[model samples]
Target chain A: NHLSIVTLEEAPFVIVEDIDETCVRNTVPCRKFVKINNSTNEGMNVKKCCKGFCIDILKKLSRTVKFTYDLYLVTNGKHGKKVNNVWNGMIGEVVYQRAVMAVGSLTINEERSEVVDFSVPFVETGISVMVSRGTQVTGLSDKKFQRPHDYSPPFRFGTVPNGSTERNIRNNYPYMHQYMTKFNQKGVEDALVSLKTGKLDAFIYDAAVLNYKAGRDEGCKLVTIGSGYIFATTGYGIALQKGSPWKRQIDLALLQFVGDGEMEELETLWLTGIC
Target chain B: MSTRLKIVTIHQEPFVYVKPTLSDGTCKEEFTVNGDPVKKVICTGPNDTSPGSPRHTVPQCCYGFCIDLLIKLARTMNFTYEVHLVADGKFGTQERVNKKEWNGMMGELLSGQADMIVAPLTINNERAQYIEFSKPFKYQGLTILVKKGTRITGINDPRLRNPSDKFIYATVKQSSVDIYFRRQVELSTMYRHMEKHNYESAAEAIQAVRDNKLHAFIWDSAVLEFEASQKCDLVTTGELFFRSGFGIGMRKDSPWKQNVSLSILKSHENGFMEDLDKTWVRYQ
Candidate 1:
């Protein structure tokens, strides 16, 4: 059978719902993200997320296989809605199986996996530190949470409840009870305020989260310490509805996605998820 | 007969004194020089009085650290000039410069109303524009005076993110604190919003804030810290926002500039600056 590659009249599209797709910096190259006017759409005003990195990789793969394609975004997570609903709102509720590939942090649990076929792992990382100026601690060892010989005053430390890093710190630090006092604030932002006030010595959190704040927040500095437990390495993957015949096509596309060196290019552009 | 140099001597205990002479040694026992009995020449600068009042009566004999430094400096330079003990712009303490009044005083010296100024005149760029400066005697940074038990740790603290509201700031009118404070407020993420006010002296600013009328005050670290010892309600963090120095000021283009600068450098190298610090400066 002869297949002819021709420019399609109907544009190819993908739907994505991400919390801050281009936030902090344009790191996530989810296919649906639009970057325009030389700014990322995640937070920057008036910038369009043009056919992004993921889209470019997918398109190149399609081109190599002699197929015409077009890429489009369903929605960004600006409006208050679940990612699926947000995507549905932009693309239409009756999207066909395999109509779109969701990228960025889509939280691929079993339920999500049942909803869509998954792609292989993309990126993974975890907890570090942020400190205020003139702080004596400079490196990981200096910052390691240590226990006092006597814990009379109750050394105050802040963290968000149930946060992955918080759980790790509580479980990992042998002297946590002796040397630490827990201030379970609402979230990481609240933890920062306490740290600034000196009420809280440190906020145990993910390196990316803390690093994002360090490069941005002038009030504090960052460090990584202790044995630095890596509780888990989460793998982010693209999703398409289950039983979609396009699963094979997507798995093939996912391979090309990695082989095209799109992830490396995206990391350079965003300055995140890279050593 | 020699050319009588009308000089003033500040009252310092032991080294310089205001003692009553023996009763027999007054006008009756005049010295005879070259077959002529001459009464002692009662030399007095514009700010001093004659022998009846002497240095004690004119406030000349009550010299402090800065005053003694000036007297010694004058003697070393071979300047046969009177050490005027007039209340320096302020009665005895530091006060901000009032250019007009200062220039008026300089005018007095020019018109021979007074021979020279020997007060601890602070030297700065703006003052440099108007007067000449000797080499700096001691350098001090603009210090901050905060409420007693103030939690401020460093400028990088988030509390200083907005300097305007973060601290109640004051310095001498038209002083470097006025120049530097505004910059801190504008540049500091913590203090960018606060308004800056000027006071008459670093002491006054510290006093206002210590009384809680103002939350904080900024001054020359050395000057404020020196004052910090007696200040019960305030403390100099020893953290400097800005730093500069103090020098003696003279009439602009005065021929005495080179000589004064040389003397100051010599004093500094000879550990005299450290001596002055020991003798005078006191801080917590």
Candidate 2:
């Protein structure tokens, strides 16, 4: 059976490249290269690739289940959407086509569940607002919520278009959506650029990714607000077709991986960028 | 308001009939190619895709209780659908290792290749995690079959002998029946000598029993009844046990799940399901 694998180009989870060795060199220096046959069996153009946290987990799964897979990018680089009664993007690709699995930063949500199934929480995190250092606010602590100016749309908040961050904000921070200036950025990088240039007062995104960015981009002096309060709780999962039997296999593999400490090790290595 | 859906099924007859269409324009021809090519219809009735020249097209029309239910669903929901068979015959089971990869009907549905499954799929906890299931349409249970003359007085019979005495019973390989027998092997001394054997198909397992190559066969009651009626040498030992029900399979959070579930309720309320039971399930 063909097992088509779709992953995002997000850091740690997946990082695609023209030359596979480039990815490995980022973490495991001097990584040996090996040619591998693509599992889709569509033609004989084998894909060259290195490993990420998700890739490593899938490799272990392959050994456990004796299945091979073909890797590809999410069509629009979007996790997925349920708009106008149709699914689009990464989730839609798996639901509309014959691909059995979609892995990466796919958030499990009520809307996505309408068309796709997800494994148990593979990565649990929440939303946070990141602002450039010294952007004055009444209160930035996660435990407290206050605004510097109490007026309609006084501060600009950047969020990725149609992403979990946006959905989380729209759903949980209803007042913010009504009162704040919204900047729907293409991604975290773009949002960060806006924040640093004063185009945005704050950027709302996954706490982990924002936290990582704050540490990685110290020169920009980015600081996350609501570090103590999780505005919206969310988790990522492997996207699969609803009612797939393979879900059980993947879930069990994940359970085993978690139990054996392999998942924890990968989390430490990739999520923390600590090879 | 309209959508095209795919319904996945295994060829479990009376629930899903692969009716025979003769070249003469009649529907009950036996499975043969005697005069000219005869069409073997899959998923028949009003939903039948007009049979094509035999062998040129996949056997298309299917008529069975489940097919009728599907037709009812289509009408109630105002949708159209095409029926497809699972690539593999197995209904689907958790893989011994990765549990996430599925084969057969469930696999097709999960892969998004099929929109729903409308066969005799049982609802169970392991499968519930991945897909949504409608309210049970048919409640059934496991039953045993034996060669017409073989005496099986009870679960235990001292007369039963193993391969040391060289006797064994047959079950579909890797099937729930096989697992049941294995569990029985653990608790019952009477089953000690009744060594269980695995066969790839129910036909093969039933055939093995009929041919005296194996002692008995265990499977779902309705399927065994259809197989026994289609043939003449086999008969069920008794009523079914380990009762369970079959439900329509779909993706969780599927917009259609609610509608399908409502249709099932409506069909039951309107007495349509009772009629189906008389024609298909209770007939044998």
Candidate 3:
């Protein structure tokens, strides 16, 4: 049976860079993960051309587990949450068994865990605060957890539109939802750019994603602030359908990556600390 | 400048209560902030306040185990606080209504009326969705309070569960104890039976058991222990079934969560909590 893994277009974790001519400002980027020639006509790229941190882990994991798979980006670009008592996004794919596996910045939460199984966590993460390199910000409370009340005139801040973080911002800081700007689908990249150009004062999103973005910033101008203010603390994991038989193999490979220092190396290479 | 954290609380003995000598019932203040009904008090008390008290020379009229910890948290985190008592006298419950507005301190936290909650707030899956909690300071579990001479090891004990045995019992409304009976394992009969007989406050529930309005009052072992210590006619029954611990909760990300959690751990590590626990049980 051909296996399909659901993904999201979040940077560092999973990136879909458009490197070809037909791509334009408002149009979809040439999908870097576009099909490449394989022994079987239906096979995907040989884990080459372009792959981010999460894909790289899956690459090493596939070699260890002796399995190959198909992948695609989630339409909504959300990890997942329930609405009307029904799940949506990447998590819903696995829960519904449309995708055998999911690899991205999917946080493991108490609600999501009920319908799905997650491989051993691959990343420790939380909702973190990020600011322009030039702002005289001390911590969350000073300007706040990206809340509007923290600023008198209000500083522009946002996360992915119609996504988990947006939902968190809406529920956790009710007043901010109306005032907080909403970003396009590729928000992680766009948010950092906004912060860089002084268009946005701060961005409250996942720490691991921001950490990677800040570390990999070529200009070395992006920095995450607030030492101890990480909120909604959670970890990212490879999601699987409930009672998934492949769980053992996936976990074994991930744990092996951590034990063998392969995980650390992948982190150092794809994540920051380089510029 | 320090963040002035708006706090919400309930008067639980040992955890938080009006100090005996200071409960002269003066300084009684009632008003509304943005239409949210609030009753506040500024009675003077002296117990934990000591030398070099700069941020707070005059602690609130209320004093108890939690109040002591609250003072320590404010000093450690260097934040200021304003306190208010919960009007509904509940931990909080979302029972019925459109959009289902919550009640008690949970409601206060949800409505963002309170910036933080400095009480023995139970951290559970349901509550964790809306509110964030610090690291657990005290692990609390389920136990029962009954008239003296009552005997039953636990809910599982035949003495309590047998159909032939008419051992009437109830529990605190909207408490986390429902997890054991509902989701963990459905004790269908016991669960439904207990739901029909729920009390809003500890005082009401404890009085029910004493008045024989109810045979037993199931509650947190931590509170049950303090209740047992206070009155000779009542005794804590059943085995302690603690799981989730007590934590300080907040609405949004507090800059002080890490320091607060660390301070909580430090207190437990250095026997501050243990000392506080025993001290309160004795003082009551």
Candidate 4:
């Protein structure tokens, strides 16, 4: 139990493969990912344990802990949500004694915090708007996007079902929220799919996720905007079982990694995706 | 009637620039105009004529092709004139809020601050409704300026298709290029939402291109060429589009329109305009 680390399989975080312990013990996984899928490995043939910014931090953490650890992917890809009473995804694993730690781009919210212990946030992000290129309906070049001010016609806005993005839009852009066409899709991928098909004029979501999606091949048709605005600030943290014995140790290790600039180095390596 | 004319002009480079000179024969003396240090010592070739080189050339003076042409026109038409530079170098357009209102050199002329405006004023519908223009003196077209390594060779580049791509094309707000993007292209469909980067000036647009923040910028070829020649990092790309002309602007029903037009025609015939072009436009 002290040596097991369970993480969700998501991009720039946890990319699963049988990687070299010796090679990756000091560094991160492949500089680039050939393919990433939720199900089977498919085209992911790299021989690495896990290659991502999180894995790099974990490698540094292992040095501090001085304990050899085994990395494993969660059976279910959920970042863990509490429904009525039961925990799901990685939260379920940690609560039910399946794993000692869960890591990924898991948002630290009040509800999740009650059920799982979270280390200090490693990534700070916010919600932003994404749009297809060249969608200037107004004659004015300055108003490149449909604004709530003009009131010409409401644009179709999209977000994941019951996600923070949807909630943020509802609270912040209430005027646009009322008249705008709202599409509650399954997730970011579906929302972007609708966006590419002209069903959605704009998709609002977490900036980091949307930035990655917009740059990814699947979401290449879209582009993220409004980075200059402060919509909502949230942080992604490592989720551990409630009151875990290793919480202090993990948090301290992360603090050291951050203080020593290892975390920034990891971000520069993995987060600067050209796509 | 006195053959005296009040000519309004703007201080745009090549078109017009204020050259400074020292009062004393000492070349080493620091020249100042009204307490400000003078930069260029004298109005050299192209700008080294009447108006540009006026009755008082000691402190500071206006000079350029437009000034030279005005000097030629006044001499040929046998009119004694005085040159007054517009405080702001705007070519002038109807105020956005109040169409009845005007600003820049056009404002100077309409308010009778000066009788006529001699600048690189574009002949557009909005301005035409307010003021009259002489037959065009310079025919220019729109061209794109880009960083040296930009893959976009022309408007047909695939990169232009996606404003969200790593490369983006920039334009000044409310500029001809902005209008062109709005009208000519399917802006909304290809360029997502309001992602188009709008700079305050063509210089800022060129700077964005230099920083790779913008892949390209569309502007008047004459200015783009001038900028590219002045700035080594930028280069003109794509064939010119939207060929347009710059004409002298005057008040509605001004008798000076016919006189200025005739003088322009004479200048073209006598190669005076050609000489001005060779000196200013084609110089360097």
Q: Which candidate achieves the best DockQ against the true structure?
A: 3
TM-score of 4: 0.40
Which window of 10 residues has the lowest lDDT sum in candidate 4 chain B?
A: B38-47
Q: What is the C-alpha lDDT of each candidate?
A: 0.44, 0.64, 0.67, 0.62
Q: What is the lDDT of residue B164 in candidate 2?
A: 40
- Candidate 4: lDDT of A177? 51
- Please write out the lDDT profile of model 1 over residues B1-284, one tens digit for every residue: 54323333322221122333335533233332234432222222334333234444222123344555665577677765544433222212212465433322333443444544444444433344444445456554555678778876655555555454535554554344443444433454423343345554445566688678766665556556656676666676646643344556566546665566556544543445555555556433
Best by TM-score: 3
Relative to the real complex, the DockQ score for model 4 comes to 0.00
DockQ of 2: 0.01
Model 4 bad stretches (over 4 Å): A1-275, B1-4, B19-60, B98-100, B165-168, B172-214
CAPRI class of candidate 1:
incorrect
User: Across all candidates, what is each one's fraction of true contacts kept?
Assistant: 0.00, 0.00, 0.00, 0.00
Better of 1 and 2 by lDDT: 2
Question: Per-prediction count of colliding residue pairs?
Answer: 34, 22, 2, 20
User: B163-260 in candidate 2: lDDT tens per residue?
Assistant: 34554665564444443444443324433444346565576678788778977676777687777776778877755554445789998758897567
Give the C-alpha miss distance for residue A126 in model 1, angstroms. 50
Q: In model 3, which runs have C-alpha deviations exceeding 4 angstroms? A: A1-275, B1-3, B19-60, B96-98, B162-166, B178-185, B282-284
lDDT of 4 by residue, B70-138 (tens): 777777767776676654434555545635667667778888877777777665545555676765567
TM-score of each: 0.36, 0.44, 0.45, 0.40
The window of 10 residues in a row where model 2 chain A has the poorest summed lDDT is A26-35
**Model 3 chain B poorest ten-residue lDDT run:** B48-57
- lDDT (tens digit, per residue) of candidate 4 on A1-275: 34667776667676665545444453344322245775756544343556677777777777886766656666543677555787777777788777778777766554555567777566765566777866543311124222654645555665664444444455445555554434566776687778888888776666677776666645355766543222344557787777577765676676456444566677777776555
Model 2: CA > 4 A from native:
A20-50, A134-153, A172-175, A178-182, A273-275, B1-284
Which 10-residue span in candidate 1 chain B carries the lowest summed lDDT?
A: B86-95
